[model samples]
Target: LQLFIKTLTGKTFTVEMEPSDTIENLKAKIQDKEGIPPDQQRLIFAGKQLEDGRTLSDYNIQKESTLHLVL
Candidate 1:
């Protein structure tokens, strides 16, 4: 999947992951890429808050998804 993660600074990040990836996976990736801590990485996609225990498939994610990040 191609994920577009947008930040409050108006920055958009593109990342690749499998459908099996969870919200926690994305958060860790972001933390690695941007140096932001995982605790501050809150992801909201399609008006829904993604949970760490759930897979991307659980959220009805698509090939290209935009996730709004809250820090």
Candidate 2:
């Protein structure tokens, strides 16, 4: 799956993942790709905070859906 993520600073990136991937997994990938530590990253989707244990599908995230990342 491909995810569209945007940082609070307006930076954006495309992330690839498996269907079962958790938010925590995405955070680690984001950290590797964006250089933001996972501990310092917060993810939000549709105004709701995304929990680490939750899968993207659990949040009903679709292709092109924008997830916001904040430090």
Candidate 3:
């Protein structure tokens, strides 16, 4: 899967990841890129919010799905 990092600082990062990665892992990656803490962040996808431990498979997202993350 492809990971995209969008920060409140108006930056967008593109990276490759795996579908098996948990939401927490993604959060950590975002924190690493944007310098934020995981516990303080929120992930939004398809207008819905997600919690840690959730997997991409839970969303049934397609290959080209575009998810958003906010803090």
Candidate 4:
């Protein structure tokens, strides 16, 4: 699935992932794509902060859903 991530700078990017992937997995991709450390990546979806231990489906994330990425 393709996920949309919005940065604090108002930039947006697409991240590819399986629906089964965890937030930690997304963070790793963000680290590689944006050069932000995974530990420093904070993700929020649907007004809820996403936890590293949880899967995307756990937060009801879907294709093109905008995820706020903060460092």
Instruction: Please report, in order, the local distance difference test score of every candidate based on alpha carbons.
Output: 0.87, 0.87, 0.70, 0.88
For model 4, how does the per-residue alpha-carbon lDDT over 1-71 read when each residue is reduced to its tens digit? 88899988989998998889998999989988889998888898878899987999998888878899887
Q: Whose TM-score is higher: candidate 1's or candidate 4's?
A: 4
Task: Write the residue-wise lDDT of candidate 2 on 1-71 in tens digits.
Answer: 78889887878899987757898999999988888898998899999999987898899888778889888
Against the hidden true structure, what lDDT does model 2 obtain? Answer: 0.87
User: Candidate 4 — which residues are off by over 4 angstroms?
Assistant: none
- Candidate 3 vs candidate 4: the lDDT winner is 4
TM-score of 4: 0.93
Show the colliding residue pairs in model 3. none
lDDT of 2 at 46: 91
Q: Any runs in candidate 2 off by more than 4 Å, and if so which?
A: none
Question: Could you give candidate 3's per-residue lDDT for residues 17-50 as a string of tens digits?
Answer: 5777787877777777767798877767777877
Q: Which regions of candidate 1 are displaced past 4 Å? A: none
TM match of model 3 to true structure: 0.74
Ranking by TM-score: 4, 1, 2, 3
Instruction: Estimate the TM-score of every prediction.
Output: 0.92, 0.90, 0.74, 0.93
C-alpha RMSD of each candidate structure in angstroms: 0.9, 1.1, 2.1, 0.8
Candidate 3 minimal-lDDT segment of 10 residues = 60-69
**What value does the lDDT take at residue 2 in candidate 3?**
74
Q: Indicate the residue-level lDDT of 36 in model 3.
A: 74
The window of 10 residues in a row where model 4 has the poorest summed lDDT is 38-47
